[PDB]
Amino acid sequence: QDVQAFLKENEEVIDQKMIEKSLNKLYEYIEQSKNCSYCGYHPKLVVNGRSIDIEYYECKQQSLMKSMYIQQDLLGATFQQVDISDPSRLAMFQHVTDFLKSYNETGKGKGLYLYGKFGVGKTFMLAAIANELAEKEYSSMIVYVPEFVRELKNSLQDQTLEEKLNMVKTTPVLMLDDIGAESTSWVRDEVIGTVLQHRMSQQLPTFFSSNFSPDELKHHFTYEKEEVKAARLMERILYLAAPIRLD
Amino acid sequence: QDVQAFLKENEEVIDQKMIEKSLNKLYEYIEQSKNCSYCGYHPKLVVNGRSIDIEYKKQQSLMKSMYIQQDLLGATFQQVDISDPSRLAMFQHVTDFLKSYNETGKGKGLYLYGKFGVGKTFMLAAIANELAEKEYSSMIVYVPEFVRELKNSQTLEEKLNMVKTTPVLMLDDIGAESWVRDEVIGTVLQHRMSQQLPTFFSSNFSPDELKHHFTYSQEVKAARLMERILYLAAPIRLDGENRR
Amino acid sequence: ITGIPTGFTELDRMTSGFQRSDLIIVAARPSVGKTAFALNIAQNVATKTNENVAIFSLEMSAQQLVMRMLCAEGNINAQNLRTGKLTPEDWGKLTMAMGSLSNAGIYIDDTPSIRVSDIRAKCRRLKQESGLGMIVIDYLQLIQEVSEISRSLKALARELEVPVIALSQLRPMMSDIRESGSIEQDADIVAFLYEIIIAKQRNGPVGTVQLAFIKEYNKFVNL
């Protein structure tokens, strides 16, 4: 309601274009919860350059667990902490136990697909496979995706972060995150092309869970001879993961 | 100028940018015939994802009730007896608002919940003549007779355009026949909360009961259908002797 | 702007013009539009510098077309400015519609189902009648029997010493103005409307460009 008032107040200055460009944002803004159940954050609009974003304003395994590009305040959820009256959270319950079993060192199997809205928390659900693959002497790492483009375009003076991913590619249960409206297009044939080869040079299971869907994740990165280069290196992402269904 | 009017009309629903994106639609909407010829369809705006589409006494006259008996809809207020918390804890939300009803500012409706026969629909058909002292296109409907012929097909692209954002909707009875109703009334009740609108309810059971009865399987699609019907108002009791 | 201006500033750092002597055809689509393109190739070029113009609006009376650019220069077309007395409000931004379109020099048009020897006898005393910067002629699919007109439309930019315009109403590519015309050997810069597919010249620049639309004011947008 405040946005409406402000919009018409300065509509002579703001205009409409930017509005139509950020339509998706403004529509998603109004469609979601304006409030929060803590009354922990609330959505507010912010102008960032030429685009309008949505920021939130506030209303045995610890020295083993050392996840890069993410905190340790994010990895503290199990599965017995996870509710089932929703049609999403139990899917995970049935999925991973059957993968506590088909793999006895080297398996080359399937994966999981949590994609869609913004509220479930697809890193707390993943901070659970990460949570109890560390009672053992092994892992299920969690590293964010846009951070492979946040500190990886200024520093290409050879090596740097061509040599800290060298060992983050020797852990089996590695999980891939927010691919879609979070990560511009130099990276896919030098990193996320060479991410899914050397693990599959001996074959293994890898993971992908973000927000933008399968028959859509192949398309969000042509930022044809552009859609097809988004149909080879990704023919090892949909070739290595099975979807979960947000009913 | 029309855009300004429409924008603020549905500003609760529209995301400023959504308006400019669906500009062509909204402009084509207003430019075409807002009426029909059966009086066979009329255009109404609907929000589909990020885009807005276009889907098709001398007091009881221009009204347009759906699927109801012809002359049963005549009821007053002096004639309505005033009894228990069936009629002495309701004329406190009804009369605070009479000649003071806006659009561009959500109003409070009511949910008449209770028994099988006492007086479900005498406080949604009486007030439909307070919505006849001013005369709205006030809708009165049997929802037992609504999930049948609209399962059918012929014509089906747009069958509920008078069961969404009309100035008034006195919904009566839902007691027959993961449901065939989550992309139906569950998105119908979505346009009753972002284009500035209130609605009116009365049925056979109750809020507790109806939540325990809707949509069954082996999914909280049964406990989301009914707070789309417990938002604009707080439900109150109906008590008294039987009337048959 | 080399030149007496083309259309857009990212379309005047592209191809560059309008320069000395060119036959032009912007083969404009039905269904989508060709109305506001004229309200954005010859709407501001008269109202800034004294290389004035003229507007050919053949098949329709020139005066119905005067609800198109005044409702696009004074940004007033939603109350509405095509049917009588407005509500005591839309008499607001009138000071921008005709307040610049009369201190220039224009001859709007709707003279009979013409051949083309008119704008030869007419343009022998309209080069000497007006001020001249562009000469905006109707779409290339009425004047007659359609192909002959474009062939003798090349020379027209070379007489009055000003580039001359004649659009079209046939994807859109260069082989649909062909299913009703000739053109290729004649017009050597064919822009379009879906997207101004300016895919023809020797000057250098040729690109893929569409623009945003508002249609409550009929406005074009570049970025």
Residue numbers in the entry:
A (entry chain M): 32 to 70, 82 to 101, 112 to 235, 237 to 276, 281 to 304
B (entry chain N): 32 to 70, 82 to 98, 111 to 207, 211 to 234, 238 to 278, 284 to 309
C (entry chain F): 183 to 326, 338 to 363, 374 to 397, 413 to 441
Copied sentences from the primary study:
The overall architecture of the 570-kDa complex exhibits a three-layered ring structure along the c axis of the crystal. The NTDs of BstDnaB together with the HBDs of BstDnaG form the first ring that lies on the top of the second ring, which consists of the CTDs of BstDnaB. The NTDs of BstDnaB pack into a more rigid triangular collar shape that exhibits a threefold symmetry, whereas the CTDs have a relatively loose collar shape with a pseudo sixfold symmetry. The BsuDnaI on the bottom forms the loosest triangular collar of trimer of dimers with an obvious threefold symmetry as well. The diameter of the central channel is around 50–55 Å throughout its length, which is wide enough to allow either double-stranded DNA or ssDNA to pass through the channel. The CTDs of hexameric BstDnaB helicase interact with both the NTDs and the CTDs of the helicase loader BsuDnaI with a total contact surface area of ~1,745 Å2 per hexamer. Therefore, it appears that the NTDs of BsuDnaI have the major role in recruiting the helicase loader into the prepriming complex. The CTDs of one dimer (chains N and O) exhibit a different orientation from the others and do not directly interact with the CTDs of the helicase. Moreover, the structure and the proposed model suggest that the release of helicase loaders may result from the binding of ssDNA to the helicase ring, which is accompanied by the shift from the ‘open-ring’ to the ‘open-spiral’, and then the ‘closed-spiral’ state of the helicase ring.
The replicative hexameric DnaB helicase is composed of two domains that are connected by one flexible linker. The larger CTD exhibits a classical RecA fold, binds the nucleoside triphosphate and translocates the protein on the DNA, whereas the NTD surrounds the single-stranded DNA (ssDNA) during DNA unwinding and binds the primase1920. The DnaI helicase loader belongs to the AAA+ family of ATPases2526. Here we report a crystal structure of BstDnaB helicase in complex with BsuDnaI loader protein and the HBD of BstDnaG primase at 7.5 Å resolution.
